[PDB]
Amino acid sequence: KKVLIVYAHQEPKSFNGSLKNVAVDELSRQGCTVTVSDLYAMNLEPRATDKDITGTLSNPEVFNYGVETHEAYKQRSLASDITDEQKKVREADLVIFQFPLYWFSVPAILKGWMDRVLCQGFAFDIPGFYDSGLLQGKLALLSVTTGGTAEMYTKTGVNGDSRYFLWPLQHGTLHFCGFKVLAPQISFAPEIASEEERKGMVAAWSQRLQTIWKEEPIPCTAHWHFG
Amino acid sequence: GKKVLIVYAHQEPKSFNGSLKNVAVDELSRQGCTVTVSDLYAMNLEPRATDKDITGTLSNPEVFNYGVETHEAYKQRSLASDITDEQKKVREADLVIFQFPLYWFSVPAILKGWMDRVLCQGFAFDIPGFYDSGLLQGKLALLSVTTGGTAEMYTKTGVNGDSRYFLWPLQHGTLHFCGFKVLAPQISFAPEIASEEERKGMVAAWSQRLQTIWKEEPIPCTAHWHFG
Ligand SMILES: Cc1cc2nc3c(=O)[nH]c(=O)nc-3n(C[C@H](O)[C@H](O)[C@H](O)COP(=O)(O)OP(=O)(O)OC[C@H]3O[C@@H](n4cnc5c(N)ncnc54)[C@H](O)[C@@H]3O)c2cc1C
Ligand SMILES: Cc1cc2nc3c(=O)[nH]c(=O)nc-3n(C[C@H](O)[C@H](O)[C@H](O)COP(=O)(O)OP(=O)(O)OC[C@H]3O[C@@H](n4cnc5c(N)ncnc54)[C@H](O)[C@@H]3O)c2cc1C
Ligand SMILES: C[C@@H](c1ccc2nccn2c1)n1nnc2ncc(-c3cnn(C)c3)nc21
Ligand SMILES: C[C@@H](c1ccc2nccn2c1)n1nnc2ncc(-c3cnn(C)c3)nc21
Ligand SMILES: [Zn+2]
Ligand SMILES: [Zn+2]
Incomplete structure (x- = not known):
């Protein structure tokens, strides 16, 4: 099994x-093929411009x-940075996204990855989206950290x-491209939490990765997200 | 003399x-509004949140x-000049219109970068000082969004929700969290698929709305409004 x-x-x-x-360590330990796109260290171009062709x-x-x-x-004429990421995704059986929540979403650098990598012909087509997406057979998983507490992130809470x-x-994004989506890993408020709570959140993530291949994907529906 | 960014x-x-x-520039200018445009692609705005911003x-x-x-x-007035210049434009603006095509059910990353980098703590919000106590209280925001997806795809029964x-x-x-009151969004569905005559109607409708934009009340930006 191959993980990006x-x-x-x-x-x-x-x-x-x-x-x-911890994801690299544990997945490597199981004998998975592991690849990491460290977007900030790569200084990944986030802007969707004509330089991409x-x-x-x-x-x-x-x-x-x-x-x-x-x-x-279709003409194999995309910028090398796009096509290199496309090769990694094409090979991957599981794609984990690791990021802090920025304005109820991904940081713009990661938004750029999504905008530029998952182009028409590679990630989806017409037809060929949602369950018929071109990345069907693959799994995606969001591992997100937040500043906001769990209680703030409830239906009654101030953030919803x-x-x-x-x-x-x-x-x-992910379902649209044919990924089945595994349950998100949400590590709430590490800054506010105690060191012992932080250790528990890391241990929980480690623990989950041991059995990641036996998990069922969520039903990625309006009903799942909005109750 | 109202000011629009x-x-x-x-x-x-x-x-x-x-x-x-x-059309927003033309119509708002015609009413005698002060109009400013941050054309993010032409500015080649840095979207990445890095240490170069201090x-x-x-x-x-x-x-x-x-x-x-x-x-x-x-607090130390030590942010990169591109951030601080956009902060000045927002500080002066009574209304901020965001014009963009929908990219993956959200803003294009260049615009996401603007949001990440411009709306920093101390300027746009504080703790406490968010939502109704946000530091940009008194201002109005409005999303003008275009989509590839049709109106019918963007319904509760539809495939996009x-x-x-x-x-x-x-x-x-983002916007409510910083203290903006939010005006109803302008959503121009599927211009690529629509006929030229339909496209003209969507532009004329946006023009028409802008004529009376200062008499509008903001939406109640609640969970109930978005999900009820
Ligand atoms: C532009 C912007 C927008 C944002 N928007 C939002 C938003 O909309 N909603 C929201 O909820 N939040 C938001 N945030 C807050 C953000 O999500 C959090 O600050 C972030 O998720 C925290 O993650 P971190 O990895 O930076 O934590 P850190 O600050 O790096 O970690 C906290 C502590 O954990 C420690 N640590 C590291 N490794 C370990 C270990 N193995 N064991 C124990 N401790 C360890 C660190 O040393 C540190 O002391 C935003 C932040 C920014 C900058
Ligand atoms: C990376 C990426 C991600 C995307 N993600 C999504 C998504 O998640 N959901 C979704 O629904 N869509 C998505 N799209 C599609 C995108 O939102 C639409 O293509 C876009 O919103 C259309 O706006 P436009 O200005 O580009 O249209 P254009 O292609 O510029 O306009 C269509 C036609 O209108 C003509 N025109 C221009 N001005 C006028 C006028 N005054 N009168 C009459 N005709 C005129 C043009 O000449 C053109 O032929 C995505 C696209 C990309 C590239
Ligand atoms: C940090 C977190 C938050 C906000 C208020 C608060 N009071 C006690 C604890 N608190 C935690 N929070 N909750 N929702 C948020 N949305 C956005 C941001 C944010 C935006 N930029 N930065 C730097 C943080 N922070 C957010
Ligand atoms: C292309 C557009 C679309 C897809 C199917 C369809 N049938 C009738 C009208 N239709 C319109 N569409 N609808 N939802 C979308 N979400 C995302 C994208 C998209 C375009 N480029 N990228 C990178 C994503 N396109 C989308
Ligand atoms: Zn889904
Ligand atoms: Zn709100």
Whole structure:
């Protein structure tokens, strides 16, 4: 089994850093093939621009990013950074995303990865989205840290249920491309939590990774996310 | 004399998004509003949250915490000039319009970068000082979004779910959290699939709405509004 970890934190000693390393350690220990895209260390280009196609653009007078990258994929003309990430995803049976929550979503660097890597022809098609997505057969999993407490992330809480913010990512992106989505790993409020609680959150993540291949995916539906 | 900031995120001036931005500029300018546009792609705005965003001595130089460092940087007036210039535009604005195509049920990463880097602690919010006590209280925000998906795809029964589901992180999680009152979103569904005559109608509808934009009340930005 082959695992891609897409990681988006600036600081290796971070709680996010620890969770990534524990995933590398434990998956490597089981005998999985492990790859890590450390996006900040790669200085990954997040912007969707014409630099993402290498050669003459199909319509040079009026640039349409969606249309041009789809044609570029079919012609094998995408920038090498995109195509290298596409190779890693194509080979991967499981893709883990490790990141701190930025404005109820992924950090922009990781948003850029999503925007640029998962292009038409590679991740989806028409037809070929949701259960018919082109990355069907693969598993995705969001491992997210938050500043907000668990109690803030409830239906009655001030931020709403944590499942509300997962919708664009799990359904809108991952399910749309054909991933089956495993339950998210949410490590609430490591900054506020005690060191002993932090250790428990890391141990729980380690523990889960031991049996990750036997898990069932969630039913990625409106009903799951919104009750 | 009302002041409008348009944060615009499309690569191509002749785009449908471009047209909507220009019509907003034209119509708001015609009313006598002060109009400013942050064209993010033309500015080549840095989207990445890195240590380059602080120009000064870091509170903890051995272990970098972006949140903690940018908060201290704001108080010390030590943020990168691109951040502080956008902060000035927002501080002056009475209304901030965001114009963008929907990218993966959200904003394009360039615009996500603007949100991550501009709306830092001390400027946009504080602890306490968020949601109704946010530091940008008194201001209005409005999302003008285009989609590839049809209106019918963006319903509760539809395959993408209700459009209000994807607005939650943006309107509540970001804008409300900073103290903006949120005006109803402008959603221009599926311009690529629509006929030219339908496209013209969608632009004219946006123009028409902007004529009376100052008499509108904000939505109640609640869980109940988005999910009820
Ligand atoms: C632009 C921006 C937007 C944000 N938006 C949101 C939002 O919308 N909603 C929200 O809830 N939050 C938000 N946050 C907060 C953010 O999600 C948290 O700060 C982040 O998730 C914390 O993760 P971290 O890895 O940086 O924690 P850290 O600060 O790195 O970790 C906390 C502590 O854990 C320690 N640690 C590391 N490894 C271990 C280990 N193995 N065992 C024990 N302890 C360890 C660290 O040394 C540190 O003391 C935002 C932050 C920023 C900068
Ligand atoms: C990375 C990526 C992710 C995406 N994710 C999503 C998603 O999650 N959900 C989703 O629904 N969609 C998604 N899309 C699709 C995207 O949202 C649409 O392609 C976009 O919203 C359409 O806006 P546009 O301005 O690019 O349209 P354009 O292609 O610019 O416009 C369509 C046509 O209108 C014409 N036009 C321009 N101005 C006028 C005018 N004044 N009058 C008449 N005609 C005019 C143009 O010439 C053009 O032929 C994604 C696209 C990309 C590239
Ligand atoms: C940090 C966390 C939070 C907010 C208030 C609070 N009072 C006691 C504990 N608290 C924790 N929080 N909860 N929702 C959030 N949304 C956004 C952010 C945020 C945005 N930028 N940064 C640096 C943090 N922080 C958020
Ligand atoms: C293309 C558009 C779409 C797909 C199917 C369909 N049938 C009738 C109209 N339709 C419109 N669409 N609908 N939801 C989408 N979500 C995402 C994307 C997309 C485009 N580029 N990328 C990278 C994602 N496109 C999307
Ligand atoms: Zn789903
Ligand atoms: Zn709200």
